[model samples]
Target chain A: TRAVSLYFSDEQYQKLEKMANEEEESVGSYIKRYILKALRKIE
Target chain B: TRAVSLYFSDEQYQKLEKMANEEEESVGSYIKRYILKALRKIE
Candidate 1:
């Protein structure tokens, strides 16, 4: 596995954190589910 | 595959569009990348 980092201003992080909750997922799993679904659109 | 839709306020849509362009990705691709990266944090 690999790791990555980015600079998020306080407000940016807040918006980001908000979306995960809105999606009813931990940030990781929420995003994972979305990505997996998106990928599945391909082969 | 399935399709989903989202509603964003004007400001939110503006920012969303901005980020997608800044990231040099189509709205769909950046999200796909983001979700994949986030999910990869786990096994």
Candidate 2:
């Protein structure tokens, strides 16, 4: 496995936090889902 | 800015690496763009 880092402005972080909560996902997992989606995976 | 982490299997990471190389972007920057794209930003 590889560990990657993400940098986000506070405002953007808050936005992602909100969305993650709405989806009942941890912020990290939520972001992972987004990356997978970007990769064209059916998640 | 806030720092976050991403966990990916070797296979997944390799796939990302290929795409990043094809785009002529650093792996980190390429992943960042995908995150931004996921955030629905017009990059």
Candidate 3:
């Protein structure tokens, strides 16, 4: 596995954290899922 | 700023790396851009 660190402003991260919590996912997993969505590889 | 480390399979990272390179961006920035796109913050 590859581990990449992403940097974001606190505000941006807060927003993402909230969104991830809503989906019951960790921020990292949420991001992965989002990327998969962008790639059209997942529903 | 907040730093978040995301983990992905090697294959997934490769795909993201290629896509980022195509856009002439680092994977982190590309992912940020994609997230902002999802948040409807950029063109």
Candidate 4:
């Protein structure tokens, strides 16, 4: 597996971290869930 | 005590677990943290 980096606007980044923190998740983990959810919707 | 149930699409449910796994967390713990974090920001 490969690791990738992402960029976010200030508010977006803040919101991302807030969500992850709320969920007790690392940013990477939350991102994984979001990505997989998006993919599942398409297929 | 009050217990609440949340609804998710099958895929959303799957991804929720995936993220929990990636973060090494329980689903209950993750959700609790997420909600608390949201409350903190508004204060």
Candidate 5:
């Protein structure tokens, strides 16, 4: 299986970390779940 | 009612226009419909 991939700037990373903390999730997991959800909606 | 607003770079705008042409829709209507559909999915 292929690993999930994504890219963001340092500033964006910080913002994501803050948002993840609010939702009580790790940054990596938050991004992975968000991308998967968005992709599913597209499909 | 407040008018719908969106921002895009020149290159992005061109891409949107091309996609709209492929779908045989006007640019304005295409954007409006696309944004509304995406928002509904999010909600």
Candidate 6:
């Protein structure tokens, strides 16, 4: 599958990593879900 | 501390909950961080 791209600082990445663990998802999937949800709101 | 408010759908809220749990942050704080980051990008 193709991948989407985004950037984050060290701290932000750490925070997202932590959240992903709690949600039992990989960091990439967690971020994707976040982006998808945000986009859904705007569209 | 003061409070900020925003709206989300059921699915969005669930994603936020998952992310917040993983990150060890409240949903409010997570959202605040997201907003702040977006604002920084624009500014």
Off by over 4 Å in 1: A1-43
Q: What DockQ does each prediction reach against the true complex?
A: 0.07, 0.61, 0.61, 0.03, 0.04, 0.04
Backbone atom clashes (below 3 Å) for every candidate: 0, 0, 0, 3, 0, 3
Candidate with best TM-score = 2
Q: After superposition, how far is residue B28 of candidate 2 from its true place, in Å?
A: 1.0
Residue A17, candidate 1: Cα error in Å is 18
Residue A6, candidate 1: Cα error in Å is 24
lDDT tens readout by residue for model 6, B1-43:
3222333456665665677888886765565466446534522
Our model 2 lands, by Cα RMSD against the true structure, at 3.3
Error of 3 at A28 (Å): 2.8
* lDDT tens readout by residue for model 4, A1-43: 2332343445545565777898886765665555544545434
Fnat values, one per model, are 0.07, 0.76, 0.79, 0.00, 0.00, 0.00
Please give the distance, in angstroms, between residue B2's alpha carbon in candidate 2 and its true position after superposition: 0.4
Q: Give per-model TM-scores.
A: 0.36, 0.78, 0.74, 0.42, 0.43, 0.44
Model 2 lDDT at residue A38: 65
DockQ for model 2 equals 0.61
Model 1, A1-43: lDDT tens digits are 3222233345434444567788774654443444445445432
Lowest-scoring 10 consecutive residues by lDDT in candidate 3 chain B? B34-43
Give each candidate's interface RMSD in Å.
15.9, 2.7, 2.7, 14.1, 14.5, 12.8
Model 5, runs deviating above 4 Å: A1-43
RMSD of each: 14.5, 3.3, 3.5, 13.7, 11.7, 14.0
What TM-score should be assigned to candidate 2?
0.78
List, residue by residue over A1-43, the lDDT tens digit for candidate 6. 3322334566666666777788885776666556565656634
Ranking by lDDT: 2, 3, 6, 4, 5, 1
Cα TM-score of candidate 5:
0.43
User: Tens digits of per-residue lDDT for model 1 on B1-43?
Assistant: 3233333244433444466888775664565456445544533
Arrange candidates, best DockQ first. 3, 2, 1, 6, 5, 4
Error of 3 at B6 (Å): 1.4
